[PDB]
Amino acid sequence: YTIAERPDLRVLRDPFSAKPHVLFYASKRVGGDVSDFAAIKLLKFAA
Amino acid sequence: YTIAERPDLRVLRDPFSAKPHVLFYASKRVGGDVSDFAAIKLLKFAA
């Protein structure tokens, strides 16, 4: 499994949209799927 | 009578909320009621 990501947490406080509040907008971006299909085995329970 | 206040007026102007406008927002916070009921006497005009 290979995980790709940006190593931060972009926070943007928004005193404008919801006016008497602050509305912090934090967003980390991360992705990833299996890269080596031979390196993972599973246990299915059926038969 | 005790006045509790934050000795500043906080201003916030958002060109972003409604774009063609500015929407100045200015606020201060204050509060207070009586602290010594024995130090304020009134004059009712009834009896």
CB pair distance less than 8 Å for A15 and B14: yes
SS3 B11: strand
Kindly report the length of chain B: 47
Give the residue from B33, B36, B28 showing the smallest Cα distance to B5: B28
In angstroms, the CA B47 to CA B39 distance is 22
Q: State the amino acid at position B13 in one-letter form.
A: R
Strand pairing report for B30-31 and B4-5: antiparallel
CB pair distance less than 8 Å for A15 and B17: no
Chain B 14-43, residues with CB within 8 Å of chain A CB atoms: 14, 16-17, 25
Q: Is B12 on the interface with A (CB under 8 A)?
A: yes
- B21–chain A nearest CA distance, Å: 13
Give the residue from A16, A25, A14 showing the smallest Cα distance to B16: A16
Q: Which residues of A touch B12 (CB under 8 A)?
A: 15-16
**Phi/psi zone of residue B24: left (φ > 0), alpha (ψ -120 to 50 degrees), beta?**
beta
Provide the experimental method for this PDB entry: cryo-EM
What is the resolution in angstroms? 3.4
Q: H-helix or E-strand containing A3?
A: strand A2-5
In angstroms, the CA A13 to CA A17 distance is 10
